[PDB]
Amino acid sequence: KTASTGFAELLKDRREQVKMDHAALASLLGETPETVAAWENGEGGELTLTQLGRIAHVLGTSIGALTPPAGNDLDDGVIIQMPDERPILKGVRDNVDYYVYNCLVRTKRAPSLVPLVVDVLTDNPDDAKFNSGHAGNEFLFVLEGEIHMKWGDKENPKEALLPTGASMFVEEHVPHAFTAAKGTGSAKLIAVNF
Amino acid sequence: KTASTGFAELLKDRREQVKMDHAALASLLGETPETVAAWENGEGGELTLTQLGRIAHVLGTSIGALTPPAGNDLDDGVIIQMPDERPILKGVRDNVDYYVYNCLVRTKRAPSLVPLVVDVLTDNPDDAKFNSGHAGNEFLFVLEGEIHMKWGDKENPKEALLPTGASMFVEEHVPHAFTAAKGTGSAKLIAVNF
Amino acid sequence: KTASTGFAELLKDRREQVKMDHAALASLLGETPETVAAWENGEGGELTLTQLGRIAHVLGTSIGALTPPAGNDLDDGVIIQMPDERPILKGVRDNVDYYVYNCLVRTKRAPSLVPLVVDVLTDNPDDAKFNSGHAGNEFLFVLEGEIHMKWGDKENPKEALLPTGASMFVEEHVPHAFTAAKGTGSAKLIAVNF
Amino acid sequence: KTASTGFAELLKDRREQVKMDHAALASLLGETPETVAAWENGEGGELTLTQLGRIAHVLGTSIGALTPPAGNDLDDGVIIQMPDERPILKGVRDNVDYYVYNCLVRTKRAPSLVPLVVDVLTDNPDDAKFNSGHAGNEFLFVLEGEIHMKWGDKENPKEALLPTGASMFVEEHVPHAFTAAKGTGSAKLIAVNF
Numbered sequence: 129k130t131a132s133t134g135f136a137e138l139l140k141d142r143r144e145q146v147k148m149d150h151a152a153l154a155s156l157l158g159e160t161p162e163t164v165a166a167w168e169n170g171e172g173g174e175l176t177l178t179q180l181g182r183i184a185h186v187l188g189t190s191i192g193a194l195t196p197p198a199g200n201d202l203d204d205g206v207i208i209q210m211p212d213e214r215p216i217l218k219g220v221r222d223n224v225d226y227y228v229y230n231c232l233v234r235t236k237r238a239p240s241l242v243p244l245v246v247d248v249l250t251d252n253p254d255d256a257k258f259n260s261g262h263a264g265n266e267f268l269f270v271l272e273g274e275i276h277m278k279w280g281d282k283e284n285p286k287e288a289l290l291p292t293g294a295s296m297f298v299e300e301h302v303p304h305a306f307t308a309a310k311g312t313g314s315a316k317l318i319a320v321n322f
Numbered sequence: 323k324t325a326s327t328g329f330a331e332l333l334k335d336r337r338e339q340v341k342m343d344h345a346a347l348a349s350l351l352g353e354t355p356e357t358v359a360a361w362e363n364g365e366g367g368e369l370t371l372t373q374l375g376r377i378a379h380v381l382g383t384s385i386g387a388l389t390p391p392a393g394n395d396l397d398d399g400v401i402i403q404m405p406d407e408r409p410i411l412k413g414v415r416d417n418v419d420y421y422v423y424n425c426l427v428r429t430k431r432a433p434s435l436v437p438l439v440v441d442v443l444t445d446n447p448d449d450a451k452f453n454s455g456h457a458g459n460e461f462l463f464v465l466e467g468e469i470h471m472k473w474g475d476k477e478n479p480k481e482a483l484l485p486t487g488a489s490m491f492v493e494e495h496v497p498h499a500f501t502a503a504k505g506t507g508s509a510k511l512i513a514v515n516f
Numbered sequence: 517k518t519a520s521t522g523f524a525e526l527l528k529d530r531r532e533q534v535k536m537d538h539a540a541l542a543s544l545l546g547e548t549p550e551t552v553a554a555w556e557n558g559e560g561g562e563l564t565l566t567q568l569g570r571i572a573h574v575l576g577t578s579i580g581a582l583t584p585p586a587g588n589d590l591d592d593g594v595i596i597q598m599p600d601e602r603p604i605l606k607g608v609r610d611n612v613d614y615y616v617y618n619c620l621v622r623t624k625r626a627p628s629l630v631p632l633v634v635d636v637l638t639d640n641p642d643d644a645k646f647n648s649g650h651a652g653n654e655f656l657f658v659l660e661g662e663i664h665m666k667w668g669d670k671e672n673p674k675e676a677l678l679p680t681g682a683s684m685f686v687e688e689h690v691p692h693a694f695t696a697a698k699g700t701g702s703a704k705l706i707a708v709n710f
Numbered sequence: 711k712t713a714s715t716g717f718a719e720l721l722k723d724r725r726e727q728v729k730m731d732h733a734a735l736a737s738l739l740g741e742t743p744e745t746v747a748a749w750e751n752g753e754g755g756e757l758t759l760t761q762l763g764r765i766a767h768v769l770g771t772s773i774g775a776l777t778p779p780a781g782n783d784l785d786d787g788v789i790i791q792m793p794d795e796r797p798i799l800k801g802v803r804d805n806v807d808y809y810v811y812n813c814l815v816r817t818k819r820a821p822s823l824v825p826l827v828v829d830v831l832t833d834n835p836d837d838a839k840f841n842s843g844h845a846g847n848e849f850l851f852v853l854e855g856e857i858h859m860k861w862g863d864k865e866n867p868k869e870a871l872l873p874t875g876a877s878m879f880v881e882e883h884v885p886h887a888f889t890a891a892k893g894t895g896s897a898k899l900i901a902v903n904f
């Protein structure tokens with residue numbers, strides 16, 4: 129569905145549930161009832177983010193509540209990604225090639241799902257670079273080599289030396305950091321954020 | 323919070339969780355990395371609904387996921403409405419004054435909460451006008467008089483004669499209709515959609 | 517649905533999603549595979565709360581996850597309560613008849629919905645008795661008289677004199693207290709927790 | 711927390727939100743007010759599943775609502791699993807060694823997370839054995855060899871030959887089946903249910 133059509137149907141839904149008519153709503157917004165009716169007819173495409181903010185406010189709700197869901201990109205409930213179409217993204221922390229993100233399949237039917245094959249470039253734990261924790265839990269699996277894992281307080285953290293085949297879970301907002309085992313050059317792991 | 327600032331922070335959050343940088347994102351959108359950086363700096367206010375649709379799509383998520391929540395209009399967790407500031411809205415079904423909606427307090431911290439004092443104008447059950455059911459459950463309480471309630475199939479519905487003080491619950495999407503008891507003139511009830 | 521049958525189906529579901537068979541599960545619990553199979557066949561009725569605790573633990577989940585939902589008590593999506601079948605419950609704070617709760621309709625399809633007609637017995641604000649705030653938001657409507665509302669810090673609270681017909685919203689965990697307006701004897705309000 | 715203590719605190723919470731006192735609740739259950747008070751004091755451990763069913767019913771809610779959450783087994787937000795402590799479970803479909811499940815790390819803070827390394831034993835697509843779809847989405851990654859994937863209608867399904875390194879997503883309730891590519895002997899993949 130388009131932003132316009134989704135908005136058109138949801139706006140009408142919301143307007144009706146708070147008992148307003150085109151006239152009533154048009155008044156609170158300083159618009160004409162025809163304008164409002166136009167939106168409800170799919171002509172809202174050029175409304176600005178700020179204007180959408182006002183409409184949501186007047187309807188005592190959020191912009192998200194008035195916009196359609198992510199959408200559906202599945203092929204009969206499935207979506208596949210070949211190994212050569214994986215987007216690559218160099219990760220840099222403190223002007224260093226820390227990670228290399230090879231992005232796996234993603235779908236608008238589960239936006240929070242972000243699976244990655246991560247090349248861990250550095251192999252000096254003492255130079256581990258912490259992220260500040262992030263929303264969503266994360267599942268990890270060591271694909272190759274040994275990983276030196278660090279989590280918690282970046283000043284005084286807990287650590288773990290993980291052999292190939294190990295698997296771990298990091299709750300959301302828990303700060304963590306990885307490097308390959310001391311001197312082993314590099315390691316590789318699968319990270320699934322969900 | 324504004325639409326612009328909320329968008330700016332959420333866009334950055336999302337861009338980072340799918341591992342893209344300004345360059346990567348700017349490319350999929352056919353924009354310049356400076357443009358994207360501008361959005362992330364609160365300058366997205368004039369983006370159109372349709373453009374927001376594209377950005378969401380490229381980031382494999384929804385517009386709602388990139389926009390801030392409804393907002394907070396409470397006064398230390400509370401919000402009050404005096405009886406004279408209630409918005410009134412005449413309800414018309416089949417060119418008739420069916421209901422009269424007196425809207426009670428609402429808050430952006432619970433958008434689905436829509437409480438109403440409803441004047442039931444007609445008193446001829448045989449002329450009951452059905453709504454087609456709606457999202458969200460609804461709690462009813464008969465404030466004055468007797469209500470003749472109808473729900474289910476509008477062709478062959480179930481009925482109930484409700485005395486003052488009665489209370490009922492209607493699950494979402496269950497079509498219903500009300501009128502005052504046969505010949506009793508009018509009735510009044512409290513309807514709380516949540 | 518029964519506790520036994522719901523448990524039987526959900527236990528099997530969970531056992532299968534963690535890839536265990538009767539033997540595997542029976543082992544972690546110190547039971548025989550036949551015992552486990554019995555549970556999955558509706559014979560778990562006499563399992564104790566503590567035993568259910570162990571089963572949940574071994575299956576790394578909660579007891580709730582292994583038990584059926586509240587159930588359905590609706591009559592085609594609706595449930596009605598006549599004014600004379602309302603359960604009455606005297607409310608006492610500091611050995612005083614503070615409130616009188618007349619409980620309205622409730623349903624297992626929305627357990628959090630607790631609507632009440634509350635008789636406010638005291639009319640001395642200075643003797644207001646605070647609750648410590650509670651889970652779930654609450655919608656209030658003054659049915660009769662004047663209410664003296666208090667919320668926030670019980671040591672230094674905010675106040676509001678509410679006329680008949682006023683409506684208010686109290687967010688969850690916000691401590692509040694009510695009495696009838698100073699010297700007006702008593703008042704009455706509708707309180708809907710959802 | 712224990713089943714007993716969690717129940718004790720939640721029962722009290724629920725009893726209070728529906729305005730009942732020990733006497734009122736004890737009456738609907740055919741128990742003594744002291745009995746009820748005992749439960750609220752952690753002595754409910756021996757209550758049977760069926761009895762818990764009644765208590766939930768009387769309180770118009772679910773057993774889950776009266777029992778504590780799964781619990782917390784993390785070590786400062788993290789939990790690790792070494793490759794040799796992975797529980798193994800042979801998978802059999804039609805009296806054949808179809809799969810071999812090597813279970814990875816799991817946590818009570820995300821019960822729906824069930825990650826597995828799956829050895830795909832058969833390599834004859836024509837003999838693919840379908841599951842009937844299951845709750846929860848699933849992320850797959852081909853670890854070794856080639857997988858012949860099948861999903862949808864088991865009578866007339868869609869197929870995909872997946873090379874090592876491919877990744878896929880299967881929405882919940884979509885029936886699927888895997889085997890190694892025709893004649894290639896065996897394959898191995900990572901399956902993450904969340």
Ligand SMILES: CC[C@H](O)P(=O)(O)O
Pocket residue numbers: 246259262266304306319
């Ligand atoms: C293995 C990748 C890490 O979890 P990130 O969330 O990118 O810091």
Ligand SMILES: CC[C@H](O)P(=O)(O)O
Pocket residue numbers: 421440453456460498500513
């Ligand atoms: C009393 C008003 C009815 O519930 P509606 O939802 O407007 O049809």
Ligand SMILES: CC[C@H](O)P(=O)(O)O
Pocket residue numbers: 615634647650654692694707
């Ligand atoms: C009117 C009753 C109050 O809201 P309580 O939640 O009982 O303190």
Ligand SMILES: CC[C@H](O)P(=O)(O)O
Pocket residue numbers: 828841844848886888901
């Ligand atoms: C790869 C394993 C399958 O997805 P299952 O859910 O076990 O049938």
Ligand SMILES: [Fe+2]
Pocket residue numbers: 259262266304
């Ligand atoms: Fe991470």
Ligand SMILES: [Fe+2]
Pocket residue numbers: 453456460498
């Ligand atoms: Fe309605």
Ligand SMILES: [Fe+2]
Pocket residue numbers: 647650654692
């Ligand atoms: Fe309250």
Ligand SMILES: [Fe+2]
Pocket residue numbers: 841844848886
């Ligand atoms: Fe599966």
